């Protein structure tokens, strides 16, 4: 049938980023590194007396 | 140090001085000499009298708790150790079990050996069991409250208070607390409501002493501002604060320094999970462990990981933390997998982690101090607030520095930046602990439960509340102040004129217009052409510090957008500088004067100096210029200017003549002229007022001034008193009852309904909304996974960036529930409750409905981590709360015979409770 809808109505824009749905995600654990490891320890590395104490 | 003891006694009580007490036997012995504060508190326990111990965490409060446990077990009694949060309970359970053997645990997450003589439980479980009226309480002789000062928490504080009030009078209490200033009140409150004595043992004792250091951002080292003797180093502090006013990678240098000077282990605190891992990332280039150490901890690590299946073992959260650990670097925050959180604690205690990046919560963990403690900052989000960390908080956290056996001292380093104000910084390192002020507030589950039970009432709870108690104490103190003010007022109410009123009005009006003139003439567009070398200027920085007349040396465009007045720096010579001001810290174009820089006062010596000011600090511009020295930095030249100033002041005793803004500075636009004319009108009008010439003046004026202040203080004081009345809370009560009536939870006669009874047994989510949901039937037609998902809307308490686009099988129940919430928020408003109806509805967070829904349908952990930005550990935390909630619903269904509901809720439990979510704890 027709692969579209007619829709002239507005929808309130989402308050937040749209999360991925179950369909978009597989069970490969190593993928977390890119998908969720941003700025985290498991992210992917670039590889791919005395008054004063000095730092010295 | 010194030990202070006091006791609060019931009326007509036969008291023998605690220090005379000689115990016949020691219910527990220790391999070290007791400290007197311990000895004393233990006598109290031997005598069967309650006691609040108030001491710092390294001081050995645990010795006292242990004694109470042993004595109870000895007397075949039962004892309860209440912890603030579940994580500490698990830790404490592990410690007590190994010691006393006869120990069990009851938390939101688990129950172990519930018949044991010694029960470790959270305040929340205690609360439930009391309202539940469990027979366990009958056998209980002693209840220990660990960290009772958490009773002052704005949202969770009420639980402590609530459960204390609820305890049987026969019970005795050991309260463990931080060093609080108002211990006496607490004791007395205990004394009144439970009709028994309550001792107080206080001490500032620290086994290992603290040194406090400031680290200014981009600086070169750290500055000792409080030494082991607790002496404040004013001079060094000043140096530190000036170093940042003149001015994420610093941390790396700091840790390296700590390593080089053998100050490890160090806990590096931050106040966000994110900050923690970032910081750890910088460290990893370094390596702090020997190959033997690496091997040892790897064994410990694997042994912990062993219970987990390979599929979980392969999560990069697990696989890629091990390389950090091996280098001696740890992370700790509520976002990690629980299993990692635990093993890291363990690896830390065994000394395998030399640097630990952690959020605040680690500070109250059990037996995990360090040699050094670093605050990367002292600002924390209260979700929607910006806290300068309290003094008390700074202390408690900084108290984690200094290891009793092994360290001469604890090292505390506070990193600071330009945002830091000196008074605040000074306040922290000289940390004074905060009062223990009740944060009591009425709650529906509370009220409902009180109504349900025969012998007690909401009105009772209020009456016995620490909150109300703190009122009945404070109010009379205030009425005494008021009366003293009132007496002074009614006595100072001797105004001879109302002409005074006119005088005041004119004076201030003039003052205001002259300021307008000031803004104009000091504006760079007007003033810079008249600030030639030697120009006489009258200085008043920040409008507070009056240096009198000085002389311009030079000026220049400020180089970092500021306001116009703030956009130029003028260097001036003053000869009124306080002799001991740290003029060595002054920098030639930093208008923010160092702490200590001030004018001299009546009986002090002065020195000459060159200070940088902005045009805001210029009060007037004179029509004179000194001849300036060619080299103001050459010996004696400042003092030479000073001499010339003295001569100028002597040649003009009644004020140095100023530039006429009109005739000299040529400021002649229309508005400026009528401004001068207004000033002109008022000055002659002023001269007409009889008082202006007369001798009364300050007498009549100061009198006029005093009454109004006094009137103000009174008005203000009358208000504080008004809001310290029991009726407030009583209003809150009647309102909330309306709600319960209107919703059908209780009768108009305040008799509980069937709906009230179920709400009684719900503590994990909003008991109103959940109850309504249940009785309207929303769960009737949902599959369990739907119910799970809907229920996640109550267990999820975290904030997140992503949100799912819900398909109808979740969007509809969500909608249906928001409708009921709405109806509820209606009725809330209907009863004059301070509730913002939209925020309520939205408080039930939905962002994990699809995560929970699919987890329940068999998605792997990996998949649901991909479906949200919420942290893995947080995810498991949410599931665990979700389980608890569900169990509570299983319970209520059971107790109202709704077999269908019960089975549904049970089914949900079976869907949730699996794999990584069902992983057990390293401690249990
Ligand atoms: Cl908790
Ligand atoms: Cl390695």
Distance of CA B52 to the CA centre of its chain: 23
The CA-CA-CA angle for residues B235, B239, B244, to 5°, reads 150
Q: Which of residues 489-508 of B touch A (CB under 8 A)?
A: none
Residue B919 token pair: 């992983």
The DSSP annotation for B848-871 comes to THHHHHHHHHT--HHHHHHT-SS-
- Check A42 against B236: CB less than 8 A apart: no
Same-domain status, B884 and B776 = yes
Place of tokens 């006119």: B502
Long-range own/partner contacts, residues B751-755 (CB < 8 A, 24 or more apart): B751/B451, B752/B448, B752/B451, B752/B452, B754/B896
First and final C-alpha spacing in chain A: 75
**What gap in Å lies between CA A44 and CA B241, rounded to an integer?**
39
Burial class (CB in 10 A: 0-12, 13-18, 19+), B228: middle
| Integer CA distances (angstroms), A52 to B220, B223, B421, B586, B745, in order | 9, 5, 21, 19, 66
Same-domain status, B145 and B234 = no
Residues of chain A in Cβ contact (below 8 Å) with chain B: 14-22, 24-33, 35-37, 39-42, 49-56
Is there a binding annotation on residue B399?
Answer: no
Residue B437 lies in a domain: no
| Integer CA distances (angstroms), B650 to B549, B645, B827, in order | 12, 8, 77
Q: If residue B283 lies in a helix (H) or strand (E), which one and from where to where?
A: helix B273-283
**What gap in Å lies between CA B863 and CA B915, rounded to an integer?**
14
Residue B456 lies in a domain: no
Q: If residue B539 lies in a helix (H) or strand (E), which one and from where to where?
A: strand B535-541
- Check A32 against B227: CB less than 8 A apart: no
Residue B331 token pair: 């992370």
| Integer CA distances (angstroms), B671 to B667, B678, B681, in order | 10, 11, 15
**What gap in Å lies between CA B722 and CA B475, rounded to an integer?**
9
Residues from chain A that touch B847, judged by Cβ atoms under 8 A, are 16, 19
- Check A51 against B233: CB less than 8 A apart: yes
* Helix locations, B327-465, DSSP H: 338-349, 391-398, 422-429, 444-452, 458-464
Residue B383 token pair: 């979700």
Measured between CA atoms, how close is B220 to chain A, in angstroms? 6
In contact, B94 and B924? CB cutoff 8 Å: yes
Residues from chain B that touch A21, judged by Cβ atoms under 8 A, are 804-805, 850, 867
How many domains does chain B divide into? Answer: 4
Same-domain status, B178 and B219 = no
Residue from B527, B689, B677, B688 nearest B613 by CA: B527
Is there a binding annotation on residue B57?
Answer: yes
Place of tokens 């009583």: B730
Same-domain status, B190 and B214 = no
Same-domain status, B224 and B261 = yes
**What gap in Å lies between CA B258 and CA A5, rounded to an integer?**
66
Mapping DSSP onto H, E and C, the string for B687-704 reads: HHCHHHCCCCCHHHHHHH
CA Rg, chain A, in Å?
A: 24
Q: If residue B373 lies in a helix (H) or strand (E), which one and from where to where?
A: strand B372-375
In contact, B112 and B105? CB cutoff 8 Å: yes
Residues followed by a break in chain B (C to N exceeding 2.5 Å) are: 247, 560
3-state secondary structure of B167: coil
First and final C-alpha spacing in chain B: 38
Q: What are phi and psi of B401, to 5 degrees?
A: -100, 140
Residue B699 token pair: 């007498």
Find all residues with CB under 8 Å of B245, minimum gap 6, and list them. Answer: B418, B590, B592, B594
**What gap in Å lies between CA B229 and CA B226, rounded to an integer?**
8
How many beta carbons lie within 10 A of that of residue B666, not counting itself?
10
Measured between CA atoms, how close is B356 to chain A, in angstroms? 13
Measured between CA atoms, how close is B795 to chain A, in angstroms? 19
Residue B200 token pair: 């107080």
Same-domain status, B185 and B61 = yes
In contact, B214 and B240? CB cutoff 8 Å: yes
Place of tokens 């030079």: B554
- Check B854 against A22: CB less than 8 A apart: yes
Residue B834 lies in a domain: yes
Same-domain status, B349 and B230 = yes
Residue from A12, A14, A38 nearest B846 by CA: A14
In contact, B96 and B367? CB cutoff 8 Å: no
Residue B439 lies in a domain: no
**What gap in Å lies between CA B896 and CA B499, rounded to an integer?**
79
Q: What are phi and psi of B183, to 5 degrees?
A: -55, -45
Q: Dmax of chain B from CA atoms?
A: 101
Q: What is the CATH number of the domain that holds B550?
A: 2.40.30.300
In contact, B53 and B18? CB cutoff 8 Å: no
Place of tokens 């391999």: B31
3-state secondary structure of B534: coil
**What gap in Å lies between CA B617 and CA B592, rounded to an integer?**
11
Residue B742 lies in a domain: no
No. of helices (H) and no. of strands (E), chain A: 1, 2
Q: What is the CATH number of the domain that holds B36?
A: 3.40.50.300
- The ligand whose atoms approach the alpha carbon of B326 most closely is 2
Listed resolution, Å:
2.4
Buried b (16+ CB within 10 A) or exposed e, B267-296: bbbbbbbebbbbbbbebeeeebbeeebbeb
Q: If residue B294 lies in a helix (H) or strand (E), which one and from where to where?
A: helix B291-305
**What gap in Å lies between CA B398 and CA B372, rounded to an integer?**
9
Same-domain status, B316 and B379 = yes
Of the candidates B236, B256, B320, the beta carbon closest to that of A42 is on: B320
Place of tokens 């005598």: B47
Same-domain status, B177 and B273 = no
In contact, B266 and B355? CB cutoff 8 Å: yes
Kindly report whether the peptide bond that precedes residue B265 is cis, defined as omega within 30 degrees of 0. Answer: yes
Residues from chain A that touch B860, judged by Cβ atoms under 8 A, are 27
**What gap in Å lies between CA B624 and CA B152, rounded to an integer?**
61
Residue B730 lies in a domain: no
In contact, B5 and B200? CB cutoff 8 Å: yes
Measured between CA atoms, how close is A7 to chain B, in angstroms? 18
User: Which domain range does residue B150 map to?
Assistant: 3-203
* Helix locations, B59-143, DSSP H: 61-74, 86-100, 123-131, 136-139
Find all residues with CB under 8 Å of B227, minimum gap 6, and list them. Answer: A49, B211, B233
Residue B821 lies in a domain: yes
Distance of CA B516 to the CA centre of its chain: 41
Q: How, if at all, do strands B172-177 and B140-145 pair?
A: parallel
Q: If residue B552 lies in a helix (H) or strand (E), which one and from where to where?
A: strand B545-557
Measured between CA atoms, how close is B223 to chain A, in angstroms? 5
In contact, B752 and B452? CB cutoff 8 Å: yes
Place of tokens 């160092």: B594
- Helix pair angle (B466-492, B183-194), 10° resolution: 120
From B636, B659, B682, the end of a domain falls on B659
Q: How, if at all, do strands B266-269 and B618-625 pair?
A: unpaired
In contact, B195 and A29? CB cutoff 8 Å: no
The CA-CA-CA angle for residues B133, B110, B901, to 5°, reads 70
Question: For residues B127, B130, B133 and B135, what is the CA-based torsion angle, rounded to 10 degrees?
Answer: 120
**What gap in Å lies between CA B797 and CA B802, rounded to an integer?**
15
**What gap in Å lies between CA B310 and CA B723, rounded to an integer?**
60
Same-domain status, B223 and B371 = yes
**What gap in Å lies between CA B126 and CA B259, rounded to an integer?**
45
Place of tokens 């047994």: B761
In contact, B266 and B283? CB cutoff 8 Å: no
Chain A CB within 8 Å of residue B850 CB: yes
3-state secondary structure of B551: strand
* Helix locations, B610-762, DSSP H: 637-651, 670-688, 698-722, 726-743, 754-760
Mapping DSSP onto H, E and C, the string for B600-629 reads: CCCCCCEEEEEEEEEHHHEEEEEEEECCCC
Q: Tell me the count of A-B CB pairs closer than 8 A.
A: 116
Beta bridge partners of B537: B550, B621
Of the candidates B233, B278, B867, the beta carbon closest to that of A20 is on: B867
| Integer CA distances (angstroms), B913 to A41, B85, B280, B703, B887, in order | 28, 22, 33, 75, 12
| Integer CA distances (angstroms), B476 to B189, B479, B483, B492, B725, in order | 16, 5, 10, 24, 11
CA Rg, chain B, in Å?
A: 34
- Check B224 against A52: CB less than 8 A apart: yes
| Integer CA distances (angstroms), B611 to B569, B571, B590, B602, in order | 10, 5, 9, 21
From B659, B691, B707, the end of a domain falls on B659
**What gap in Å lies between CA B680 and CA B661, rounded to an integer?**
14
In contact, B450 and B457? CB cutoff 8 Å: yes
Residue B848 token pair: 């994990």
The DSSP annotation for B777-813 comes to TTTSS--HHHHHHHHHHHH-----SEE----HHHHHH
Q: Which chain A residue shows the shortest CA-CA distance from B315?
A: A29
In contact, B643 and B605? CB cutoff 8 Å: no
Same-domain status, B36 and B63 = yes
CA-CA-CA-CA torsion sign (B375, B379, B381, B382): positive
Residues from chain A that touch B260, judged by Cβ atoms under 8 A, are 56
Residues in chain A: 56
The CA-CA-CA angle for residues B418, B419, B423, to 5°, reads 100
Q: Dmax of chain A from CA atoms?
A: 84
Residue from B290, B325, B285 nearest B305 by CA: B325
* Interface residue of A13, A24, A28, A52 to substitute, partner B, most B CBs within 10 Å: A52
Measured between CA atoms, how close is B312 to chain A, in angstroms? 9
**What gap in Å lies between CA B906 and CA B840, rounded to an integer?**
29
**What gap in Å lies between CA B551 and CA B865, rounded to an integer?**
68
**What gap in Å lies between CA B79 and CA B570, rounded to an integer?**
71
**What gap in Å lies between CA B733 and CA B8, rounded to an integer?**
31
Buried b (16+ CB within 10 A) or exposed e, B235-250: ebbbbbbbbbbeeeeb
Q: What is the CATH number of the domain that holds B888?
A: 1.10.3380.30
The DSSP annotation for B470-492 comes to HHHHHHHHHHHHHHHHHHHHHHH
Find all residues with CB under 8 Å of A53, minimum gap 6, and list them. Answer: B213, B221, B222, B224, B257, B261
**What gap in Å lies between CA B466 and CA B474, rounded to an integer?**
12
In contact, B53 and B174? CB cutoff 8 Å: yes
Of the candidates A22, A24, A36, the beta carbon closest to that of B859 is on: A22
Mapping DSSP onto H, E and C, the string for B378-413 reads: CEEECCCCEEECCHHHHHHHHCCECCCCCCCCEEEE
Find all residues with CB under 8 Å of B471, minimum gap 6, and list them. Answer: B724, B725, B726
* Interface residue of A13, A14, A41 to substitute, partner B, most B CBs within 10 Å: A41
In contact, B244 and B420? CB cutoff 8 Å: yes
Q: Which of residues 261-320 of B touch A (CB under 8 A)?
A: 261, 274, 277-278, 280-281, 311, 314-317, 319-320
Looking from the CA of B183 toward its CB, the CA atoms found within 13 Å total: 24
Strands (DSSP E) found in B91-192: 103-106, 111-112, 118-122, 140-145, 172-177
Residue from B635, B598, B615, B631 nearest B555 by CA: B615
- Check A55 against B869: CB less than 8 A apart: no
Beta bridge partners of B266: B355, B372
The CA-CA-CA angle for residues B287, B291, B293, to 5°, reads 85
**What gap in Å lies between CA B742 and CA B737, rounded to an integer?**
8
From B177, B203, B229, the end of a domain falls on B203
Residue B383: which region, alpha, beta or left (left: phi > 0; alpha: psi -120 to 50)? left
Residue B71 token pair: 């004595």
The CA-CA-CA angle for residues B817, B822, B825, to 5°, reads 130
- Check B256 against A24: CB less than 8 A apart: no
**What gap in Å lies between CA B317 and CA B332, rounded to an integer?**
13
**What gap in Å lies between CA B583 and CA B610, rounded to an integer?**
9
Residue B519 token pair: 């803004």
Residue from B667, B685, B624 nearest B649 by CA: B624
Residue B896 lies in a domain: yes
3-state secondary structure of A45: coil
Strands (DSSP E) found in B156-238: 172-177, 198-203, 210-216, 221-226
Distance of CA B694 to the CA centre of its chain: 55
Residues in chain B: 924
**What gap in Å lies between CA B501 and CA B363, rounded to an integer?**
58
| Integer CA distances (angstroms), B183 to A54, B149, B393, B433, in order | 42, 10, 18, 12
Same-domain status, B355 and B283 = yes
């Amino acid at each position: 049938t027709a692969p579209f809808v007619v829709d002239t109505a507005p929808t309130t824009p989402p308050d937040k980023l749209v999360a991925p749905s179950i369909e978009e995600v597989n069970s490969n654990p190593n993928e977390l590194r890119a998908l969720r490891g941003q700025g985290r320890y498991f992210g992917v590395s670039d590889d791919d007396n005395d008054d004063f104490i000095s730092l010295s | 140090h010194q030990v202070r003891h006091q006791v609060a006694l019931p009326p007509n009580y036969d008291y023998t001085p605690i220090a005379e007490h000689k115990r016949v036997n020691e219910a527990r012995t220790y391999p070290f000499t007791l400290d007197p504060f311990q000895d004393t508190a233990i006598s109290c326990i031997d005598r069967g009298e309650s006691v609040l111990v108030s001491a710092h965490t390294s001081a050995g409060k645990t010795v006292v708790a242990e004694y109470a446990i042993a004595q109870s077990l000895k007397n075949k009694q039962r004892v309860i150790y209440t912890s603030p949060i579940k994580a500490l309970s698990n830790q404490k359970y592990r410690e007590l079990l190994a010691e006393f053997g006869d120990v069990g645990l009851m938390t939101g997450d688990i129950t172990i050996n519930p018949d044991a003589g010694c029960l470790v439980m959270t305040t929340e479980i205690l609360r439930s069991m009391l309202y539940r009226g469990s027979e366990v309480m009958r056998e209980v002789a002693w209840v220990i409250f660990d960290e009772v000062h958490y009773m002052r928490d704005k949202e969770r504080g009420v639980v402590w208070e609530e459960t204390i009030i609820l305890l049987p009078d026969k019970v005795r209490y050991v309260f463990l607390s931080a060093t609080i200033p108002n211990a006496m009140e607490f004791a007395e409150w205990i004394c009144k409501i439970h009709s028994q004595p309550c001792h107080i043992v206080y001490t500032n004792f620290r086994p290992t002493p603290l040194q406090h250091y400031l680290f200014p951002a981009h600086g070169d080292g750290i500055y000792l501002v409080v030494d082991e003797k607790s002496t404040f180093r004013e001079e060094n502090f000043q140096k530190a604060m000036a170093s940042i006013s003149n001015q994420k990678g610093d941390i790396y240098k700091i840790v390296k320094m700590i390593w080089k000077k053998k100050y490890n282990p160090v806990i590096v605190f931050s106040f966000s999970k994110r900050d923690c891992e970032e910081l750890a990332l910088k460290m990893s280039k370094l390596d702090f462990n020997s190959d033997d150490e690496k091997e040892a901890l790897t064994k410990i690590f694997n042994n912990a990981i062993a219970l987990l299946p390979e599929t979980d073992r392969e999560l990069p959260q697990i696989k890629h933390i091990l390389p950090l650990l091996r280098r001696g670097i740890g992370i700790h925050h509520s976002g990690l997998l629980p299993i990692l959180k635990e093993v890291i604690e363990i690896l830390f205690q065994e000394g395998f982690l030399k640097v630990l990046f952690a959020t605040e919560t680690f500070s109250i963990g059990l037996n995990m101090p360090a040699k050094t403690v670093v605050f990367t900052s002292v600002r924390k989000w209260d979700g929607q607030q910006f806290r300068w960390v309290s003094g008390g908080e700074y202390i408690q956290m900084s108290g984690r520095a200094g290891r009793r056996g092994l360290d001469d001292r604890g090292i505390v380093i506070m990193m600071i930046d330009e945002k830091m104000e000196p008074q605040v910084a000074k306040g922290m390192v000289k940390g004074q602990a905060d009062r223990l002020d009740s944060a009591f507030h009425l709650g529906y589950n509370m009220i409902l439960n009180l109504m349900r039970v025969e012998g007690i009432s909401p009105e009772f709870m209020l009456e016995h509340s620490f909150f109300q108690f703190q009122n009945v104490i404070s109010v009379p103190v205030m009425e005494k102040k008021l009366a003293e003010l009132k007496k002074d007022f009614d006595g100072i109410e001797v105004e001879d004129e109302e002409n005074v009123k006119e005088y005041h009005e004119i004076e201030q009006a003039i003052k205001g217009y002259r300021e307008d003139v000031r803004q104009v003439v000091t504006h760079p567009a007007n003033a810079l052409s008249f600030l030639q070398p030697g120009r006489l200027v009258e200085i008043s920085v920040n409008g507070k510090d009056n240096y009198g007349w000085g002389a311009v040396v030079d000026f220049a465009k400020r180089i970092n957008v500021y306001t116009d007045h703030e956009s130029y720096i003028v260097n001036v010579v003053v000869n009124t500088m306080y002799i001991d001001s740290p003029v060595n810290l002054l920098k030639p174009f930093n208008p923010t004067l160092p702490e200590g820089i001030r004018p001299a006062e009546e009986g002090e010596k002065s020195i000459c100096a060159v200070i940088p000011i902005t045009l805001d600090s210029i009060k007037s511009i004179g029509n004179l210029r000194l001849y300036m020295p060619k080299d103001i930095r050459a010996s004696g030249q400042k003092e030479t200017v000073g001499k010339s100033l003295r001569e100028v002041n002597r040649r003009f005793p009644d004020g140095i003549p100023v530039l006429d803004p009109v005739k000299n500075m040529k400021i002649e636009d229309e508005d400026f002229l009528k401004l001068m004319k207004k000033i002109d009108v008022l000055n002659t009008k002023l001269s007409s007022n009889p008082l202006t010439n007369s001798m009364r003046l300050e007498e009549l004026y100061g009198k006029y001034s005093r009454k109004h202040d006094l009137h103000e203080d009174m008005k203000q004081l009358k208000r504080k008193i008004s809001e310290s009345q029991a009726v407030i809370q009583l209003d809150d009560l009647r309102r909330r009852k309306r709600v319960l009536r209107r919703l059908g939870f209780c009768t108009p006669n305040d008799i509980i309904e069937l709906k009230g009874r179920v709400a009684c047994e719900i503590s994990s989510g909003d008991e109103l909304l959940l109850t309504e949901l249940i009785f309207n039937g929303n769960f009737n037609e949902l599959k369990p996974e739907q119910a799970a998902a809907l229920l996640s809307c109550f267990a999820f308490q975290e904030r997140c960036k992503e949100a799912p686009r819900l398909k109808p099988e979740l969007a509809e129940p969500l909608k249906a529930m928001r409708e009921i919430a709405a109806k509820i928020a209606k009725i809330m408003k209907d009863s004059k409750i301070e509730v913002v109806e939209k925020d309520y509805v939205e408080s039930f967070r939905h962002e994990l409905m699809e995560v929970v829904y699919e987890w329940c349908r068999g998605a792997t952990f990996t998949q649901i981590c991909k479906m949200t930005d919420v942290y893995e550990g947080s995810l498991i935390r949410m599931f665990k709360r979700l389980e608890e909630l569900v169990k509570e619903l299983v319970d209520v269904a059971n107790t109202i015979g709704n077999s269908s509901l019960k089975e549904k809720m049970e089914a949900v439990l079976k869907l949730i409770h699996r794999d990584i979510v069902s992983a057990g704890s390293l401690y249990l």
